[PDB]
């Protein structure tokens, strides 16, 4: 029994061991009352504004659309403290944890960006933070590990399973089922068991709220489409949420195509996966024909989540949002193009979204269209990856 609907159509739910249900019910109740509490809203807005840097700019691209009839705006979440949109929701979840009287934070990370976000929120708000990371991801992201340790977070490697993100998602839940009286589980995307898809959406929704006010101010109309990459779904649903009722606005989510769909080495469960039950939810996932859960592949570490938030699968099924894929090579070209023409280094995650926008513009260069891309982070963290690929090629 819950206060809110745990399902979006047929997707979602609370598929956890019984022992965790009270933790989830307590969290949903605290969230519902926090959302009706003006003082919680004011503290959250204060931290976003004076600590994280909101509202972020909405930049009109000057050079990239030259010789077409496309107008492209970038919502500059790369300018947020931390360099990625993840900061918005970890601040809200950390305030929630304090509201519940919790004093410790548990989080999972793969690429390391959610771990860094969790650790910086925990240091600011005086919470003890422990982070689970797959030992393969530990070795490959030792910059972000040092960052987490500098911020006072305890990092714990996971060798269980494939020792990647999904195996981190499991050991965080095991810890929480024992510690939830004093600890809050800061899940990193808009997926998992209810109420997390709902909470994370609501703590990211200022992205689309700002974008709407900013585009009406600059162009006097709503965009033709807003485009966002989809790893687990938080930055996309944060951009989409405020436009869902504006039915003239296309909502386009971009899943990583990896080496290409037909190769099977991709991370596109929404369009090329299969509904199953894992990580507390019913949702499309990467799985074998026997029902075992596979990994996604993408050149961007941050799109490595093998499933997708349930609200996105709902939005797809009813035809309100459209989902497409973009391969490693397409995202790399979009990465280079934004650097050379606009002087902005985008995250390789966000380059997937940009790459689809450039495809829309180039395929139909005389189509008049107003596009907004959610630039969900900056790409300083990717320059070594991009460098190695470009030397290996010439």
């Amino acid at each position: 029994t819950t206060l809110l609907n745990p399902y979006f159509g047929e997707f979602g739910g609370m598929y956890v061991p019984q022992i965790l249900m009270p933790a989830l019910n307590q969290l949903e109740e605290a969230f519902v009352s926090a959302q009706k509490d003006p003082e919680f809203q004011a503290q959250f807005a204060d931290l976003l504004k004076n600590y994280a840097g909101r509202p972020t700019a909405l930049t009109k691209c000057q050079n990239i659309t030259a010789g077409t009839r496309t107008t492209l705006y970038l919502k500059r979440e790369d300018l947020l403290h931390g360099g990625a949109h993840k900061t918005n929701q970890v601040l809200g979840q950390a305030l929630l944890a304090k509201r519940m009287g919790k004093s410790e934070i548990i989080a999972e990370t793969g690429a390391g960006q959610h771990g860094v976000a969790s650790a910086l929120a925990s240091a600011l708000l005086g919470l003890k933070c422990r982070i689970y990371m797959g030992a393969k991801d530990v070795e490959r992201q030792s910059p972000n590990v040092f960052r987490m340790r500098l911020m006072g977070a305890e990092v714990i490697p996971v060798h269980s399973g494939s020792a990647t993100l999904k195996d981190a998602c499991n050991e965080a839940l095991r810890d929480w089922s024992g510690s939830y009286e004093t600890a809050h589980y800061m899940l990193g995307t808009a997926a998992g068991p209810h109420p997390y898809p709902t909470i994370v959406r609501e703590f990211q929704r200022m992205i689309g709220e700002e974008t709407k006010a900013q585009i009406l101010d600059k162009e006097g109309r709503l965009p033709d489409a807003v485009i966002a990459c989809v790893g687990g779904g938080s930055n996309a649903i944060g951009m989409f949420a405020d436009f869902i009722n504006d039915t003239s606005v296309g909502l386009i989510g971009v899943e990583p195509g990896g080496h290409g769909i037909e190769t099977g080495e991709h991370g596109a469960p929404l369009k090329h996966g299969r509904v199953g039950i894992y990580f507390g939810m019913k949702a499309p996932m990467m799985q074998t024909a026997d029902g075992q859960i596979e990994e996604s592949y993408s050149i961007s570490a941050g799109l490595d989540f093998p499933s997708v938030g349930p609200q996105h699968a709902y939005l797809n099924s009813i035809g309100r949002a459209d989902y497409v894929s973009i391969t490693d090579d397409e995202a790399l070209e979009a990465f280079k193009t934004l650097c050379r023409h606009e002087g902005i280094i985008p995250a390789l995650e966000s380059s997937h979204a940009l790459a689809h926008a450039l495809k829309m513009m180039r395929e139909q260069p005389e189509k008049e269209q107003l596009l907004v891309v959610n630039l969900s982070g900056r790409g300083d963290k990717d320059i070594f990856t991009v460098h190695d690929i470009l030397k290996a090629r010439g």
């Binding site: 598929y15 061991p17 019984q18 249900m21 199953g276 894992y278």
Partner: protein, 257 residues
């Protein structure tokens, strides 16, 4: 067939609790797992609880996570587990067999199709680790239509409304995990006419089996102590079986109060 009812009827006439080992199917290999199971029954197991290897067992601790990896290393698939289950049931017609599943394997080829296959191979009960009572309707309805007992865990943090649901929805037995005093949990469960409760938290020694029975539980499940004997003795398979035999027969003697 109602193997649980028969089992509990016979145990009660001889003032005994049930001893139930858990073991992952195919650990450490298909043929050696079949040896392990025949050894456990021969040494006095009253019923079996059997896990199907799953990629992401978020409700399990490290001993079981490694059991799954060992079975995946051996090439064990769900279809092979169901082959193994038919052999086990052909050899042992009366022992209750319960599966510990994760929801995706149950969901994969259709919920109804999964329980239909259990009834075909002679499984008696299914516990789905990541399906709380609140989400269980399609699973237990499919279980009941195919004469399979749906098993639910009653955790230590159980409130009264959970007790009422577990007692109404479960069949076969109630899986007991260990703030609330234990003997009044067994009391409330008997109040609500729940299926007999088996204690399954940290049952490692004969003294814990005796404690569970005296506390009011119909028996005990040793959810990982058996997998640890397999882990320790992986290099010597004949010492593995002798250690399993001595442990199980010790634990089962403890159930005779």
């Amino acid at each position: 067939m109602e193997r649980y009812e028969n089992l509990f009827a016979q145990l009660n006439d001889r003032r005994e609790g049930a001893f139930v080992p858990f073991v992952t199917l195919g650990d450490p290999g298909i043929e050696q797992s079949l040896k392990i199971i025949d050894t456990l029954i021969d040494a006095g197991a009253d019923a079996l609880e059997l896990g199907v290897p799953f990629s992401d067992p978020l409700a399990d601790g490290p001993t079981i996570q490694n059991a799954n990896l060992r079975a995946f290393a051996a090439g064990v698939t769900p279809a092979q587990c169901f082959e193994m289950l038919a052999l086990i049931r052909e050899k042992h017609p009366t022992i209750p067999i319960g599966l510990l599943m994760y929801a995706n394997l149950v969901f994969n080829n259709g919920i109804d199709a999964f329980y239909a296959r259990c009834e075909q191979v002679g499984v008696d009960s299914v516990l789905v680790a990541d399906v709380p009572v609140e989400e269980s309707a399609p699973f237990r309805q499919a279980a009941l239509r195919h004469n399979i007992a749906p098993i639910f865990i009653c955790p230590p943090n159980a409130d009264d409304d959970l007790l009422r649901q577990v007692a109404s929805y479960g069949r076969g037995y109630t899986y007991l995990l260990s703030a609330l005093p234990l003997h009044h949990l067994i009391e409330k469960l008997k109040e609500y006419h729940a299926a007999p409760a088996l204690q399954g938290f940290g049952i490692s020694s004969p003294e814990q089996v005796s404690a569970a029975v005296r506390a009011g539980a119909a028996g005990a499940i040793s959810g990982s102590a058996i997998v640890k004997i397999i882990e320790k003795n992986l290099a010597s398979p004949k010492q593995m079986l002798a250690e399993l035999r001595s442990f199980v027969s010790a634990m089962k003697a403890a159930s005779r109060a």
